[PDB]
Amino acid sequence: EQIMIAQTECSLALDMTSLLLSKFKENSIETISPFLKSTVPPSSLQFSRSQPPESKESDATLAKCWKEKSLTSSCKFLFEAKERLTSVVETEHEYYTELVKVKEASWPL
């Protein structure tokens, strides 16, 4: 579902950017989804020169807090994965102890 939405939206990216670059080179509009060429003629979209345009504190603030959340997510990942791995050790060890009962007692392997 999600990949459908995002990826097809990206297909629209390729298609409309192709509409933009179809103003010149023709080896770009060719990749657009089939319905579009049947409809809107190429070279339709065009860029405009305009504005910085604007900026806000939310930029830097989210730029910080999201990285914080990211590195902390890495911490939770490393720690909980440490838990599951340690548990895997706890499980796996019994096998080879019983294999002490096997091989260390000389049995075929």
Binding site: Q2, I3, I5, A6, Q7, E9, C10, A13, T17, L20, F47, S48, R49, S50, Q51, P53, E80, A81, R84, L85, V88, T91, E92, Y95
Partner: protein, 188 residues
């Protein structure tokens, strides 16, 4: 706010019967998008002074410095291209947003990078979200390998090579194949 959102007072158009030429900047003057120290509006102030001395638009406009909303590409009877700009000279121009008749709406033209960032962010978000409420269900084992716990598995239900020295179809597959051969066996 400046994107695909309603802002309509249709009855004005109902009076006008639609746009003509300079009247686009009338309903646009109703719009927030219209600027007060635009040359359109400071020379609207000229209309409140000289009145007669404005010509069409661009003659009085571009010759005078400041923000403007010049016309270049008509698209009758719906769209009309109208770029925002800032003259710094009677000759010089410093063009801004292409405001456009979205029909009973006019919008600033978005950056490509804005939507592109929207795509990048949403896509990588789909990746991360794929890593969210999905990951760490196939628990790893050196022996068992990845594991998939269930109240009931059904539904359905780097190691070693040498060892001891269904076909859910009851060979039904070949039987169906034979059915393909046999449906026209009399016929062929």
């Amino acid at each position: 706010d400046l994107t695909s959102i309603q802002w309509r007072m249709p009855e004005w158009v109902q009076s006008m019967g639609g746009l003509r030429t300079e009247n686009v900047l009338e309903y646009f003057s109703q719009s927030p998008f219209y600027s007060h120290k635009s040359n359109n509006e400071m020379l609207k102030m000229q209309s409140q002074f000289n009145a007669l001395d404005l010509g069409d638009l661009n003659s009085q406009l571009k010759r005078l410095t400041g923000i403007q909303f010049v016309i270049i590409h008509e698209r009758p009877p719906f769209l009309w291209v109208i770029q925002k700009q800032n003259r710094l000279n009677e000759n010089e121009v410093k063009p801004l947003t292409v405001y456009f008749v979205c029909n009973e709406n006019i919008y600033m033209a978005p950056n490509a990078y804005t939507l592109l960032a929207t795509r990048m962010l949403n896509a990588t978000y789909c990746f991360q979200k794929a890593l969210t409420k999905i990951e760490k269900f196939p628990q790893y084992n050196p022996q068992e390998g990845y594991t998939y716990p269930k109240l009931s598995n059904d539904n359905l239900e780097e190691n070693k090579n040498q060892s001891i020295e269904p076909e859910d179809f009851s060979v039904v597959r070949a039987f169906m194949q034979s059915l393909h051969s046999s449906k026209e066996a009399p016929d062929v």
